[PDB]
DNA sequence: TATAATGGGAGCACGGATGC
DNA sequence: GCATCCGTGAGTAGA
């Protein structure tokens, strides 16, 4: 339901060193299938830190 | 009174002068700095009326308490600005000139 | 995915460079690449050679010219609103005849607009295209006199504004009359001025019986050329004193002066070809050794008499022949305006030469460049042929540059254009596209250049053909003008060939456009391809041969309205012309040489070529075009990729892997759906929104100025009187909205304050001020806000300030702020969709996925089209596209089906069979037999005669699948649609017309100055125009009060509208209307005309509608 | 006398209508000379003046119609009855 | 018809 | 003579013509006063005549007067009165009106013959004053002005104003019109039904009468204000009240396309 | 020709010059008349052009200044190979000229544009049609001021007639002008201190009523 | 339109002109629209 | 279609007369705050709110519905205008 | 305020009332 | 009767 990227202000953007535009990155993040094991859990924030 | 009729007819020079609130003697519009109408020009407030509601040119009478009163200093009647839509001027020709509609 | 291509036609030559009609023209005009001494006399060179030398210092002469480098690059020019241009210097030398003094100098003539790489211009930061103009070619023509059968009018036509049309006629009284500037005079007179004598005319024109007798006038031959010259001058110039040198000057200027009268090079050539003579100059005659000498006139009169007589070999001219109509490209138009401005500069030069110090003068003192700059600027700015460029997608621009207008300066004015000029001529074949033209008032006037077509040096359009010698087709390609094409028998490109030899004893050909059946021995030439008959847009329509002309026109046109989509794909069925369209559009980024990819980024792609040099390609990202469609290039390669010359690096907008992508490939069903598709409307699935199909990025520009005023300066500031932090939240320290902030209607893009006008507070304001004990501020809120129904995310802000480096605004302007607001538009109800076949419509419903008609395997269709659109429109191409699309859906492949050499029904049946095996056999393997519903549908189809009775259910489902029909289940009921329904992949585009940019409403708002009637347009928050015909509607309904409202309260009655609004907000009934202000304006404007208009009561007593304000 | 629609419309007695059709100068000059009075009989004239057209609900046959309930009707009836 | 021409002619008579 | 947005001046051509006239007149008076010869005075008088002519009817006799650096003829009084752009046809026999809007038409079947789909935002702007009064009657706003300011920004709008807007338009009708209006059925009355989205929903049966289809046609909406105007629109102009063509007499609203197909 | 005046106009003004010359000529100097007349003709024509050319009249000296600025900027653009900035023109104009002065001089030399200049390439549209009227009050404005007067009267009715009349005379709601304390004091027959105190208590009661009902707040903008 | 006697006050003129004019774009010696205008 | 519009057209010799009658009656209703209505409480036009049924705000609907009953009298020269106005102001103050 | 100067410059259609 | 001279040639939107 939401995406934050460091040093990225809005959806139409390009991160240096990255091939995909933020729109395409989000388009990929729409296809992420996330399973919750705990029935009481309404929300989760996943963190991704990568480089090189 | 109700308007039941509309009449159209030629205008005598006297009729034209009776419509006129003043003669335009100068081919000038507005001052190049003050941006206010020039005296005896096409935009003169003396003739056609004031720019601002119930206020004269120099600002002596600024309120509705004076209505119909013509300023002595600037010669501008203190009244509604809307009269600038309604007030005819005139130009007195040195020689007669044919109205093209009735010639051509 | 694998791409299968059909057709047996092998194109010998590729499509020529598509924008070459622009590029090569302007190049040829500028000659900036040529060293000054090697320059030809064509182009602005011609202008300098025509204007100079300037005589009567005594003489100023032209040496050479040069073009410098652009002071600013293209992108910077778009940023700062500057014209992309190069400085033009001209080397001149002043020479005094007596003195011998020679003063040489290089003078600055101003700047000239440079054409960009793609064939466009940048004028004040706005991209513009100069549209080519078709007109009647210069030359000598002979046309039938409409009044007198058996008699003919000879016409001598020069270039536009190059001097007078001259008409030669044989009068009812027998004499030959010449018409110049609407003056009829005997031609014999001019002939005598030319130096002709009765002897010469008797021997030359005598062969034609009794015509020459009308040319014989004794009084004319009784006087020397001088007396006839003075007589002619008195005839052409009444009231002007008949001085000799004045007569010589006027007549020379009228005919022999190359600086005034000029035929075309085309005109010269055409007149030479027609009259069978040779012209020394481009004029009608010359001044040589003191006298006038004939060039044109005599052979012209000779041909006129020969035609009038019936002498064989003389014929009338078709003025619509494309040999008689030529194209003026951008170079020629610019050159013309250049010639004009240069001549004005010359008049200024002479006027300067009479004045001033006679001894001390330099070319810098004599030359004022202002008129030249003015002519160029005016041509590139306010001209008709200069059009705001259409960049909506790449194809838009490409087609725009290829337009041909019969309109414009020196062109046909509208409504004066009859069926003749708007028609498709037989000579348009291979030259101008018979398909693509605007519908409505512009039909036939605006056209498009054909694909293979070329415009030669003379301005005529040529089409390629192949040489056929003795039933063998060579690869030799000859480009022909229409007149040359008329000479030969030209076979069609689909003509059967075994190797290079014609394989049929009957071939279909053309002789002067006429279709004829001939033997291979009679075949001189052959078509290159069917592609050459149609435009670039029309060439993008698959199965075009199955579509009626008009819908084809619509599709062809609408393809330029296609909006670039973020997920956009190329069509499942293409014509093969896609890649070329992308490449010539310069939208996509291509590899310059063979090499390896060093770096890949969203911003930039770095490539190391064979040379070893490192080339960095910066990528254009989220750039706003003229129409507000997003322009961005996405990298199509990865780091370390090995690329060859011309390989794709980055994909432009509306491009998928270098193929033109104007839309999405969707799965459609053709069937009525609950009246939601009624009358061309379309029903789409929410799934399209879910996967972001038909979603487009749009950037809008907002601008505001802070200027110096007499009441004190306007300034951009975060301090806005009487506003909360809620309102100022997204504003930065300086008052400009921060990057990334979402904006909505009413929000402040740029805060600005303006010193209030002179304020005399009304007693109410005074008392209120006293009550609240607060001082009324000096400034008021002028801030730029988001207009109704707009907004989005703020992606950019530009701020320019007076007193800052590299920055100078227009006088009085302190600072300029531009905000860019971008939005991502999902497909919504009211948005316009269309295919390439002309089917178009707005989305009237978006269904949840569960309601959509679905396949047995559970796959719902994307789009439901109404079959009721097909039969009356007669475009069947969409049907075939749907079939082949089905096959390509289940086989997971794409096709190329060229126009007129296509995929054919049997082949499509083969592919459909192969597909059916996948669509069915998979199911049968999974452990599922035939459904009951399928049996029911199969029963219905048996009764329909669609399937053969007695075959197994599977075989019948195949029989239906080969017809491109499938069993379809209703999403709501679960029951099947009683009949089998056509389902398949179709290419559908989302057009530029979106309900978001359209929907508008107004209660009250701004009014016009004089009439006090509401403004027009959405931009001004204006009211809808209620026209004369609407008033007729209300009258015919007999609704008096509604009409009276429209006429008074709702528009120009000031008292009435104020009273109305106040009555409504108070919950009262609207008052009785009064006299509308526009009527008062009429009365006063009539009084200005010295006509007294009086409104009277029934007693004929005057009534004042001005209420005593106008009476003393 | 027979004359086509254009000349018939130009020949009409209302000068506002004729002037608002076409040949505005001609119409206005002849009308001005003759000192012509427009009686506002037709639709166009009244449309220009922003008045209520003499057709439909603006008809002299209708617009003067009154509506009264029985209570108020009796109430006025007795006032008429007592005088 | 053309005022300039007419005035030039009137001038020419002197 | 008015100062526009950027601070520059825009003016009518009549001022230029009047300037010409005044100048030539004054020069004539001074020429006479100084006792100029006859040729000069004659010329001046001629020019004065042509000036008056250009003022009253320009282009009528001779070359039409133009501005410096322009080929555009100045616009005179005669040009103001007559023509398609003239006062009568442009500003008198037709006018641009308040309380009106326009949008893209889209079909819907659900509508009864007397109804049409009206977008919420359009309805808000069209009926705005009524919405203010109603917002005052209810507790949504203290007064009129507060209500208007509340409607000014899109994020200041709550659902109460929408329900109130429903209470406003109840029983009321709007006029829908599609250009060109070829006959009196080119304008028809409908009871609006407020719908999400920006498109105007049109009933299939009136399409034929309007000559409207769904390939991107747009319609204009108008709001009759007075109780009289509303009575007229509801009795006389209501879509369901005109079923037959005033021309032929045959039913104008009848099954077509998909309807005929199904039946 | 082309200076903003018609050929014939220039001819007539030149004729005025010619008349001045005929009156001022002295044949004693042996010169041809053409020589002396030419000066007065040129002078008359130039005076004419400077006076009558512009719709908004610029005094002849100022015109000359503007023209000098033109020729200066033109010389600079001819030498530099580009249009000059304000600063460069300021330099080339000598002492007493800065960028601001040049900018204001160019601003004051701006000629007005025609309301009838066609927008779009067609016979359809006029520029003046797109320009709003900022003078006449919008219906919303009229409504606002009306509601303001009505609300102010509603607020002044909660006072006694005397103090409300004092406030109306002091703020000028009655005759249109604001009376001094001595005039209102002489009208009600009290000391100026007394009438000022009545004004104060009236204003105070109004401020209390306003704090309570919060009715007049919205009109404060 | 109502299949009954016309109501007094109906403007039948505009109705007539519209009735004649509306089909005009559908109209295709002289035939069609030109002939109509001829009459 | 407006309810009973056929019957409403049956009542008048000209449809425009019906229009005038309805419009005027609705003006009366608005002016007098509906207090002059000829409708019984069960005959009152209702509007469905978020809360519940409230009186119909539309005076035209009211006027037509009233006209359907026959309790209204329409015609020309029934009573002097000022007399009608004043009697209505007496019976139902505004 | 004075050598003498003296005549411009540019640039489709059909129907209908009139005019020679 | 045949030479001129003249007025007019859908609508909304947009720009
Ligand atoms: Mg249709
Ligand atoms: Mg349509
Ligand atoms: Mg300086
Ligand atoms: Zn004063």
From TrEMBL, chain G:
A motif (Interaction with polymerase core subunit RpoC) lies at residues 9-12. Residues 181-200 bind DNA. Mg(2+) 5 binds at residues 90, 97. The keyword Lyase does not apply. One of its GO terms (biological process) is DNA-templated transcription initiation. Mg(2+) 10 binds at residue 124. Mg(2+) 3 binds at residues 90, 94. Transmembrane segments: none annotated. One of its GO terms (molecular function) is sigma factor activity. It comes from the Bacteria. It is found in: Cytoplasm. Mg(2+) 11 binds at residues 215, 218. Mg(2+) 8 binds at residue 97. Keywords: Cytoplasm, DNA-binding, Metal-binding, Sigma factor, Transcription, Transcription regulation. GO terms for cellular component: cytoplasm. Mg(2+) 6 binds at residue 94. Belongs to the sigma-70 factor family. RpoD/SigA subfamily. Sigma factors are initiation factors that promote the attachment of RNA polymerase to specific initiation sites and are then released. This sigma factor is the primary sigma factor during exponential growth. Interacts transiently with the RNA polymerase catalytic core. This is RNA polymerase sigma factor SigA. It comes from Thermus thermophilus (strain ATCC 27634 / DSM 579 / HB8). The chain holds residues 203 to 423 of 423 of the full protein.
